[PDB]
Design an enzyme around this catalytic site. Structure first.
Site, short mmCIF file in Angstrom:
data_model
loop_
_atom_site.label_atom_id
_atom_site.label_comp_id
_atom_site.label_asym_id
_atom_site.label_seq_id
_atom_site.Cartn_x
_atom_site.Cartn_y
_atom_site.Cartn_z
N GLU A 186 -19.24 9.08 -0.32
CA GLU A 186 -20.09 10.23 -0.22
C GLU A 186 -19.38 11.34 -1.04
O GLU A 186 -19.94 11.85 -2.06
CB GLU A 186 -20.31 10.61 1.24
CG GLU A 186 -21.63 11.36 1.47
CD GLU A 186 -21.68 12.77 0.87
OE1 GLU A 186 -20.72 13.57 1.06
OE2 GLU A 186 -22.68 13.08 0.19
N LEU B 97 -15.67 17.80 8.78
CA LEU B 97 -16.87 16.96 8.84
C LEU B 97 -16.55 15.78 9.74
O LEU B 97 -15.57 15.05 9.47
CB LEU B 97 -17.21 16.41 7.46
CG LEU B 97 -17.11 17.46 6.37
CD1 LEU B 97 -16.67 16.81 5.06
CD2 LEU B 97 -18.44 18.18 6.24
C1 LIG Z 1 -14.36 19.01 4.11
O1 LIG Z 1 -15.17 19.22 2.99
C2 LIG Z 1 -14.51 18.56 2.02
C3 LIG Z 1 -13.35 17.88 2.27
C4 LIG Z 1 -12.71 17.22 1.24
C5 LIG Z 1 -13.22 17.27 -0.04
O2 LIG Z 1 -12.55 16.62 -0.99
C6 LIG Z 1 -12.88 16.83 -2.32
C7 LIG Z 1 -11.67 16.20 -3.02
C8 LIG Z 1 -11.61 14.66 -2.89
C9 LIG Z 1 -11.77 13.87 -4.01
C10 LIG Z 1 -11.73 12.50 -3.88
C11 LIG Z 1 -11.54 11.92 -2.63
C12 LIG Z 1 -11.37 12.69 -1.49
C13 LIG Z 1 -11.41 14.07 -1.64
C14 LIG Z 1 -14.39 17.95 -0.30
C15 LIG Z 1 -15.05 18.60 0.76
C16 LIG Z 1 -16.33 19.40 0.54
C17 LIG Z 1 -17.59 18.56 0.55
C18 LIG Z 1 -17.57 17.18 0.67
N1 LIG Z 1 -18.69 16.48 0.68
C19 LIG Z 1 -19.88 17.05 0.57
N2 LIG Z 1 -20.94 16.27 0.56
C20 LIG Z 1 -22.15 16.77 0.44
N3 LIG Z 1 -23.18 15.94 0.43
N4 LIG Z 1 -22.31 18.08 0.33
C21 LIG Z 1 -21.30 18.93 0.32
N5 LIG Z 1 -21.56 20.19 0.21
C22 LIG Z 1 -20.01 18.42 0.45
C23 LIG Z 1 -18.82 19.17 0.44
C24 LIG Z 1 -18.73 20.66 0.32
#
Ligand SMILES: COc1ccc(OCCc2ccccc2)cc1Cc1cnc2nc(N)nc(N)c2c1C
Length: 206
Positions: free
Chosen positions: A32, A25
């Site tokens: 977010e 992303l």
């Molecule tokens: C690269 O996509 C990532 C990358 C990392 C990530 O970290 C989760 C663990 C974490 C926990 C705490 C701090 C940092 C990381 C999650 C996602 C999928 C995601 C993200 N925002 C998202 N936001 C929206 N509005 N929608 C999604 N579908 C979405 C989706 C799939």
């Protein structure tokens, strides 16, 4: 049985419908991500002994997620891939389509089962978003709108926020968004790392 429940799509996208660049992303928005975790994680309370939400995602979204965060915790993960691969590993779950995934979930997480399914979220891939948009049980889009036309090369497949779709998809009041998600959600524009963005919830009649 197989279509008891509607699907909810969750997505962060630019005003140009940009959703991704290289298998990542092209923003890093830690609040977010934390909204995403709370939304896809939240279960109404009397339910939360039995209940877990499901996250459905395409192979490249699964690949895109930093290994330390897979599977997404406290949710039932299912990766949708037209080529029963594999890749497992930690307990987890593959199907060749959205409807095969739903069938697998209903078979696996039955009335008998200790784990029960609460809400089912499609969390992406462009390709799985397109399948979800075509599915007759999708009725809800949790969208984070990013007010900057950040260069992207993968796009949400249907301009649901545009005039052409506006008799079908309606944006809901923020109180109704907070209700659905069961907490206070910031209203209006949020600024992380030089981007304004805001949370919207959109629906359509089935
Ligand atoms: C690269 O996509 C990532 C990358 C990392 C990530 O970290 C989760 C663990 C974490 C926990 C705490 C701090 C940092 C990381 C999650 C996602 C999928 C995601 C993200 N925002 C998202 N936001 C929206 N509005 N929608 C999604 N579908 C979405 C989706 C799939």
């Amino acid at each position: 049985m197989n279509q008891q429940k509607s699907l909810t799509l969750i997505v962060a996208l630019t005003t140009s419908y940009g959703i991704g660049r290289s298998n990542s992303l092209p923003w890093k928005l830690k609040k977010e991500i934390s909204y995403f975790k709370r939304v896809t994680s939240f279960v109404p309370t009397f339910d939360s002994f039995e209940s877990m939400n499901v996250v459905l995602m395409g192979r490249k979204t699964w690949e895109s997620i930093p290994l330390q965060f897979r599977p997404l915790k406290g949710r039932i993960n299912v990766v949708i891939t037209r080529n029963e691969s594999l890749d497992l590993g930690n307990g987890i779950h593959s199907a060749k389509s959205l409807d095969h995934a739903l069938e697998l979930l209903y078979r696996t997480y039955g009335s008998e089962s200790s784990v029960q399914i609460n809400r089912i979220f499609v969390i992406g891939g462009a390709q799985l978003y397109k399948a979800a948009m075509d599915h007759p049980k999708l009725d809800r889009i949790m969208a984070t709108i990013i007010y900057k036309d950040i260069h992207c090369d993968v796009f949400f497949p249907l301009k649901f926020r545009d005039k052409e779709w506006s008799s079908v998809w309606k944006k809901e009041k923020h109180s109704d968004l907070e209700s659905w998600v069961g907490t206070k959600v910031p209203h209006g524009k949020i600024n992380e790392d030089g981007f304004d963005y805001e949370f919207e919830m959109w629906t359509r009649d089935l």
